[PDB]
């Protein structure tokens, strides 16, 4: 198959001619890719931010005329997937305590997300 | 967005209270014995209530006057902000890029340079939504790619940006640069065609590869590309066209900024757009 064949041919031509250049550039790119990975609190912060903008975006989609709404099943399955894709030891027993006890009802869910976002932004600002 | 958050937290608010206020005042009128079945008048009056109770239209200008230690610096900053925001509005208008929320617009506080991230154009799947006709002005037996804009406003010129630019610079620097850019792009005898052809074609290929129907690969795809290119070139040449009769240059641009700053259009957009700021 011609795409990866042509890409490996171009990489081989770029590696034989100028080998020192390709070596230094690949070592630089690899060290940036391994060492500038974000920590646990920054990943939790960006996860809570994308969850909060999706919650306030779906709450304004006119789901109902909003008597006392409830969460859809796909958002709950997405966040129970994200809870297993979170950090294991210490984030999960506190993140799981905020969707088992019927905290998702589109009002305490957004209030919980705002509380967690404010606490995380104060934690990252005291770094 | 950072400037808006500093203004909200300098007082006793946080900008999710704006969403809470519009949700409560929009939910308090769906009830029985209907006082407002019309959503537009209620949306306009809660827009004015947001602009008066929470965020006045002098926040950005006051922040930037407090930012610089001299008025020469603020005056030169505003003089460059008007030209760079005119270029940003042109880049948002041509190629039909999406909603420019105030966290996607970045400003350099040492030059006045404006740029934006998430420069993703809006491609609507319908060929059905169009003020123009389907058959005669353009011929497309497929229907998927159109490059259309969804927003009520033609671009983003909110009250706070308009109070920062002022009245003299919005008339003499914003609209005139927005006119001369589109005049300079249609002069050089089809460079717009040559750039926009392949940069539209890659967007068409990504549009047919995002949704899993990549099998339509034919000169019909070139017809889609040329149709979208002619549409974008027509909308660009609409700005820089001066009439044969004596008419103010920057008149279509002034009508566009009249339709982009009216509260009857800014109230009909989403709350993540932040039309008050």
From Swiss-Prot, chain B:
All residue ranges annotated as the PI3K/PI4K catalytic domain in the record: 1-265
Transmembrane stretches, start-end: none
Top-level lineage group: Eukaryota
Location of the protein in the cell: Nucleus
Ranges where the record places region Activation loop: 133-158
Domain annotation FATC: ranges: 245-277
Residues covered by region (Catalytic loop): 96-104
Family note: Belongs to the PI3/PI4-kinase family. TRA1 subfamily.
Function: Essential scaffold subunit of the transcription coactivator SAGA complex. SAGA acts as a general cofactor required for essentially all RNA polymerase II transcription. At the promoters, SAGA is required for transcription pre-initiation complex (PIC) recruitment. It influences RNA polymerase II transcriptional activity through different activities such as TBP interaction (via core/TAF module) and promoter selectivity, interaction with transcription activators (via Tra1/SPT module), and chromatin modification through histone acetylation (via HAT module) and deubiquitination (via DUB module).
Additional comment: Although strongly related to the PI3/PI4-kinase family, it lacks the typical motifs that constitute the catalytic site of PI3/PI4-kinase proteins, suggesting that it may lack such activity.
Domain notes for this protein: The C-terminal domain (2233-2836) is essential for its ability to interact with activators.
Subunit structure: Component of the 1.8 MDa SAGA (Spt-Ada-Gcn5 acetyltransferase) complex, which is composed of 19 subunits TRA1, SPT7, TAF5, NGG1/ADA3, SGF73, SPT20/ADA5, SPT8, TAF12, TAF6, HFI1/ADA1, UBP8, GCN5, ADA2, SPT3, SGF29, TAF10, TAF9, SGF11 and SUS1.
Name of the featured protein: SAGA complex/NuA4 acetyltransferase complex subunit TRA1
Taxonomic source organism: Saccharomyces cerevisiae (strain ATCC 204508 / S288c)
Whole sequence portion shown: 3468 to 3744 of 3744
């Amino acid at each position: 198959r011609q795409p990866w064949e042509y890409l490996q041919e171009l990489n081989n031509i770029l590696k034989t001619a100028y080998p020192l250049l390709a070596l230094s550039l690949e070592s630089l790119v690899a060290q940036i890719n391994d060492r500038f990975k974000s920590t646990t609190d920054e990943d939790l912060f960006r996860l809570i931010n994308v969850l909060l903008i999706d919650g306030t975006l779906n709450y304004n989609r006119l789901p109902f005329p909003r008597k006392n709404p409830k969460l859809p099943e796909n958002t709950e399955k997405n966040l129970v997937k994200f809870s297993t894709t979170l950090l294991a030891p210490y984030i999960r027993p506190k993140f799981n305590a905020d969707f088992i006890d019927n905290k998702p009802d589109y009002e305490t869910y957004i209030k919980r997300l705002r509380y967690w976002r404010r606490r995380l932004e104060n934690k990252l600002d005291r770094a | 967005h950072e400037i808006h958050n500093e203004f909200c937290k300098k007082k006793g608010f946080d900008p999710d209270d704006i969403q809470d206020f519009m949700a409560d005042k929009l939910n308090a009128a769906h009830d029985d014995a209907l006082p407002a079945p019309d959503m537009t008048i209620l949306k306009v009056e809660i827009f004015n209530s947001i602009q008066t109770m929470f965020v006045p239209s002098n926040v950005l200008k006051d922040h930037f006057t407090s930012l610089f230690t001299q008025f020469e610096d603020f005056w030169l900053f505003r003089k460059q902000f008007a030209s760079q925001y005119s270029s940003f509005v042109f880049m948002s208008y041509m190629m039909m890029i999406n909603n420019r929320t105030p966290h996607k617009i970045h400003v350099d506080k040492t030059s006045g340079n404006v740029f934006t991230l998430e420069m993703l154009p809006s491609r609507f799947p319908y060929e059905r939504v169009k003020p123009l006709l389907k058959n005669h002005d353009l011929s497309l037996p497929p229907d998927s790619p159109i490059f259309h804009n969804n927003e009520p406003v033609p671009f983003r010129l909110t009250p706070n940006i308009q109070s920062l630019i002022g009245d003299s610079a919005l008339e003499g620097i914003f609209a005139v640069n927005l006119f001369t850019i589109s005049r300079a792009l249609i002069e050089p005898d089809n460079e717009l065609n040559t750039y926009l052809a392949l940069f539209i074609r890659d967007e068409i290929i990504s549009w047919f590869s995002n949704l899993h129907r990549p099998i339509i690969e034919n000169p019909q795809l070139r017809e889609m590309v040329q149709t979208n290119v002619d549409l974008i070139i027509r909308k660009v040449a609409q700005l820089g066209h001066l009439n044969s009769t004596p008419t103010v240059t920057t008149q279509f641009i002034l009508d566009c900024i009249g339709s982009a700053v009216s509260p009857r259009n800014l109230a009909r957009t989403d709350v993540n757009f932040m039309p008050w700021f």
